[PDB]
Amino acid sequence: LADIEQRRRAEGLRRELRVRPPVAAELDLASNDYLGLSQHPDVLDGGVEALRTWGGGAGGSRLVTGNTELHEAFEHQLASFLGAESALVFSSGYTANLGALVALSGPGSLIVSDALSHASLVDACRLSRARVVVSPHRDVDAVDAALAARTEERAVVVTESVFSADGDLAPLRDLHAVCRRHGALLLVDEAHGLGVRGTRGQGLLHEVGLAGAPDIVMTTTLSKALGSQGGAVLGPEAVRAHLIDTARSFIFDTGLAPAAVGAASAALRVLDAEPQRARAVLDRAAELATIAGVTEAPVSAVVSVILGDPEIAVGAAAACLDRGVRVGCFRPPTVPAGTSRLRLAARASLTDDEMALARQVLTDVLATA
Amino acid sequence: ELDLASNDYLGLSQHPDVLDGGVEALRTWGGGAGGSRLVTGNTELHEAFEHQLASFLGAESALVFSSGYTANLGALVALSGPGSLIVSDALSHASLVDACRLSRARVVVSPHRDVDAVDAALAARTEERAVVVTESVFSADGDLAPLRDLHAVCRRHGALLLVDEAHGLGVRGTRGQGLLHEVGLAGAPDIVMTTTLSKALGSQGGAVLGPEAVRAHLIDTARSFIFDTGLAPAAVGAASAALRVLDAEPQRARAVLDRAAELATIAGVTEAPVSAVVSVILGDPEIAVGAAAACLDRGVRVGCFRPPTVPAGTSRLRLAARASLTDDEMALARQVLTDVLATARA
């Protein structure tokens, strides 16, 4: 009942408030539309055409024909682009993670999940009803130790390829080595890897040479680089079939709107035709990092700018905002108490003029902090 | 062929205004929303639709999710949690089980529409916080939940009532506002409602409706919302337009009932259907799939529930009514279903 109301008290008095409305007007360095494809003309046209062809939403789930030919065609397109045999779309990356992790583990199995994991995967781990071990961030030897000592026959090692927290890279090859050595599955969330890592933006798995691996399952969102909505699970065909019969986050879920599928497919075609875009987001990231005084070269789209106390940094975010530039802002308790930071999300579609605005605003705001 | 298996209850998925709304939304806001709705996703469009839907359903506030599934996850997880009690109806529990598991709460599963069982569960709890979860129209048999009784019992024990109106929206109510609104429970301070946008409203997504505090609470604490990139503008525009068509044309909501009755008449069912979907219980798990295959082979796709979904003695066909059903299609259904059922119950 009213229990809600002073668990407003506790976060009314304390540093947190929600939320805000836009309508396209200023410079956004906080979105994860890494390739700027969300508002690309061709993506808009693809979503519109798909919408006019199939209508709004669909109807049920599938094993032969519930949704559409559109979904399958896109699944094959994405799978072909990423080097996997099969793909299956979900309503979101969240539900894709739920479905995949639940279907590939279950009771009596082991899940080894990186500590800095997005959730998405914590809820998936809970929903899986498997034994969950949380291993230290990118600690390969810890994972190996967990896998070697297990009594459960079936094991899944879960990690992000590019971490949502700091944008750092996971040691996918080493992890896959320990996985194969102990007969474990490797499940990698490439939400921040797709369109960013790889010479052509195929993700970190493809970049480090693990595309098409028989014991690797990949998940990703369609809402970042591919600038749309929805999720996808990719891997060997058997994985897709298994998902089709068993996945409570897929059979009960009405799936993905045709418009989102068309937009994602178009975004994929533009990305495939323009590999330079994937380099462009990294280059822009580097530019932002140089503007912000960050010495560490960006390995992903997002640049973290650690300032310190949670009120010079929020002040920096407010000054940036009042000068037409919205940036990301992490503070306690989302991050450790001494590391309140700004977060700069690069996009491949950033023009030199927009970068000039960012340069002015960020230079001035940061110089006085 | 004739599809009697879809849940596009109002036939709005390809309604011209729905298409135009989605196209406009897409051309205005683009594909998806870049990020979540704590980033830059809370668009004027989402807010406007939430207010619109809340206004139509008589609720104070609404919050849209990427699906009805994630809407249920968010609502149930955020409003229960460790140290609380969840009382979940047995026949709605198989869609809501993931939410119950995710909730980290103590979960008691009560017999179908057994109000006194729920009361006994609420009275004997040690947890101050309790949530009773049910569907208004059950996906299993399309029957109605005793919402008024459940609410009386909830108020007796200071418990929250959580209702999934996925199959009630656009179907129950004089204007298709759902069962809660119909039995006079709209806008109740101790009732939270969820619904999909993918059935009657012929689009995609979910929504949680209730007191303003519920919405603010969800925005601040709901993990299937904060970590979720949300709902496409096109889906929101399509849903909004569908809602406007439904509000302007209540007869559609009446029509789906009428067709359902007709289907029930075709199948020999004596009870007038209380919802869009009609069950034809045959029996054995291959007299029913065989009947479904015969229907399919004569141009009509019907539903078929079997073990694990239903008890072994009641494997059945399911016929989903739509407002967009023509008299010609109803004639086809008459011919095919009468013929097949006579040959399945023989």
Side-chain angles (χ1 to χ4, degrees):
Chain A
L1 300 182
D3 56 76
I4 288 173
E5 147 176 17
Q6 17 203 74
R7 333 314 188 96
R8 185 60 60 186
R9 194 144 177 200
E11 296 168 296
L13 286 187
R14 228 140 147 169
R15 265 137 188 234
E16 149 51 35
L17 180 145
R18 231 83 66 182
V19 69
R20 174 244 76 207
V23 58
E26 69 190 295
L27 176 61
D28 178 275
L29 294 179
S31 86
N32 291 162
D33 188 31
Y34 296 142
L35 302 183
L37 292 177
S38 182
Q39 290 186 122
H40 190 286
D42 295 344
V43 170
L44 265 51
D45 283 344
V48 160
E49 194 283 336
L51 191 173
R52 285 175 180 166
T53 303
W54 305 93
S61 319
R62 321 189 43 230
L63 170 149
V64 61
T65 176
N67 310 356
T68 64
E69 299 186 336
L70 181 65
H71 292 78
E72 277 188 291
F74 174 71
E75 287 168 349
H76 284 92
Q77 181 194 354
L78 185 67
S80 309
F81 177 75
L82 298 178
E85 290 181 20
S86 70
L88 185 72
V89 294
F90 288 74
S91 65
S92 63
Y94 180 79
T95 57
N97 278 337
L98 293 192
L101 193 42
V102 160
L104 297 175
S105 60
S109 70
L110 170 66
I111 294 177
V112 187
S113 66
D114 188 281
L116 279 183
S117 62
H118 174 271
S120 212
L121 296 174
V122 165
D123 290 350
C125 285
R126 165 143 187 83
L127 224 47
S128 70
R129 308 187 145 264
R131 183 179 133 243
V132 177
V133 166
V134 180
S135 61
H137 187 54
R138 306 193 296 177
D139 194 340
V140 180
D141 292 341
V143 175
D144 181 74
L147 292 180
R150 77 183 199 272
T151 187
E152 304 86 0
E153 181 187 359
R154 177 166 299 109
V156 182
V157 174
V158 193
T159 183
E160 285 160 22
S161 62
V162 176
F163 293 90
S164 293
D166 303 323
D168 55 329
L169 307 184
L172 294 182
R173 287 196 68 86
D174 294 347
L175 284 175
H176 179 246
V178 307
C179 278
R180 188 159 287 179
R181 178 158 55 89
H182 298 282
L185 188 69
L186 179 63
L187 179 62
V188 188
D189 191 332
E190 285 254 37
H192 303 277
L194 180 57
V196 178
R197 296 304 302 194
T199 61
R200 298 174 59 84
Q202 304 111 317
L204 190 58
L205 275 176
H206 186 100
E207 185 184 288
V208 302
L210 292 175
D215 49 355
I216 297 183
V217 177
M218 169 189 172
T219 74
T220 188
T221 182
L222 306 180
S223 67
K224 296 182 186 304
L226 298 188
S228 181
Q229 184 210 330
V233 180
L234 303 97
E237 244 304 318
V239 172
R240 185 179 186 272
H242 183 71
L243 287 176
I244 288 290
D245 62 310
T246 163
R248 315 280 175 186
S249 168
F250 179 79
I251 291 163
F252 293 166
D253 197 5
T254 306
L256 193 55
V261 180
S265 182
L268 187 50
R269 273 183 251 104
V270 178
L271 170 59
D272 190 30
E274 307 171 10
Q276 65 267 18
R277 192 171 288 269
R279 289 185 286 270
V281 57
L282 284 176
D283 287 332
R284 290 304 197 189
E287 291 181 38
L288 287 174
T290 301
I291 291 164
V294 182
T295 53
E296 40 277 57
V299 289
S300 65
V302 307
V303 181
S304 288
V305 185
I306 300 168
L307 293 176
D309 75 310
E311 219 63 14
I312 70 105
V314 305
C320 282
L321 185 56
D322 282 334
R323 295 174 64 173
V325 180
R326 178 179 60 192
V327 309
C329 189
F330 286 177
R331 70 179 168 170
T334 311
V335 296
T339 65
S340 310
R341 65 190 68 181
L342 295 189
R343 278 246 292 191
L344 314 177
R347 294 181 284 106
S349 55
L350 289 170
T351 67
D352 293 352
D353 305 341
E354 291 172 324
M355 290 302 300
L357 177 65
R359 182 170 297 102
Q360 173 190 19
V361 173
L362 291 174
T363 296
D364 284 341
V365 168
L366 291 177
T368 59
Chain B
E1 72 195 337
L2 177 60
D3 182 277
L4 294 179
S6 85
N7 291 161
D8 189 31
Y9 295 144
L10 302 182
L12 292 178
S13 72
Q14 288 188 293
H15 189 285
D17 293 344
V18 170
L19 264 51
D20 285 344
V23 161
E24 191 188 344
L26 188 48
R27 287 246 177 258
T28 303
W29 304 93
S36 164
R37 308 187 50 201
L38 290 193
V39 283
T40 42
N42 181 19
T43 67
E44 301 186 343
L45 182 64
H46 290 79
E47 281 280 331
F49 172 70
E50 287 167 349
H51 283 92
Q52 180 194 354
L53 186 67
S55 181
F56 178 76
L57 299 178
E60 291 179 19
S61 70
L63 185 72
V64 295
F65 289 74
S66 65
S67 63
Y69 177 78
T70 57
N72 278 337
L73 293 192
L76 192 42
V77 162
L79 295 176
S80 61
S84 70
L85 170 66
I86 294 176
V87 188
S88 169
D89 187 281
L91 275 53
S92 63
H93 179 70
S95 59
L96 295 174
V97 45
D98 287 349
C100 286
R101 165 72 179 171
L102 224 47
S103 70
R104 309 189 165 268
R106 183 179 133 244
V107 177
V108 290
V109 180
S110 62
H112 187 54
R113 306 194 296 177
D114 195 340
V115 181
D116 289 341
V118 174
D119 180 74
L122 292 180
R125 78 184 200 272
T126 185
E127 303 85 0
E128 75 176 7
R129 177 171 304 119
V131 183
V132 175
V133 196
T134 183
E135 284 160 20
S136 63
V137 175
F138 295 88
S139 69
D141 303 323
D143 55 329
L144 306 184
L147 294 181
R148 183 61 75 167
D149 293 347
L150 283 175
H151 177 161
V153 164
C154 277
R155 189 157 286 180
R156 179 162 58 217
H157 297 282
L160 188 68
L161 179 63
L162 178 63
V163 191
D164 190 332
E165 286 254 37
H167 302 277
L169 180 57
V171 177
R172 296 304 302 194
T174 60
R175 303 180 65 84
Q177 306 110 317
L179 189 58
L180 275 176
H181 185 286
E182 184 184 288
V183 302
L185 292 175
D190 49 355
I191 298 183
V192 176
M193 169 188 172
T194 73
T195 188
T196 182
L197 306 181
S198 67
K199 297 181 186 304
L201 299 188
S203 182
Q204 157 179 327
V208 180
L209 303 97
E212 247 311 317
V214 173
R215 183 180 186 272
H217 179 68
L218 287 176
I219 300 184
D220 181 15
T221 63
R223 287 316 183 181
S224 56
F225 177 80
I226 292 159
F227 292 170
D228 196 4
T229 306
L231 192 54
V236 179
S240 182
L243 186 51
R244 269 180 247 104
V245 178
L246 168 59
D247 190 30
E249 306 171 10
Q251 65 265 18
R252 291 179 178 265
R254 178 66 185 88
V256 56
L257 285 177
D258 285 332
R259 292 304 196 189
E262 291 181 39
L263 288 173
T265 303
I266 290 164
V269 181
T270 55
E271 44 271 18
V274 290
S275 65
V277 297
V278 181
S279 281
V280 186
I281 305 162
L282 294 176
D284 176 6
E286 152 54 11
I287 194 60
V289 69
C295 283
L296 184 56
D297 284 336
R298 291 182 64 173
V300 179
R301 183 182 82 183
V302 309
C304 189
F305 282 182
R306 233 164 311 135
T309 75
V310 301
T314 196
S315 305
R316 66 183 66 94
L317 296 188
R318 271 234 81 94
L319 315 176
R322 292 180 283 107
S324 55
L325 289 171
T326 67
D327 293 352
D328 306 309
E329 289 173 324
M330 290 303 301
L332 177 65
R334 186 178 304 104
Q335 175 190 21
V336 173
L337 292 173
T338 295
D339 181 53
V340 168
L341 288 177
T343 305
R345 295 173 309 192

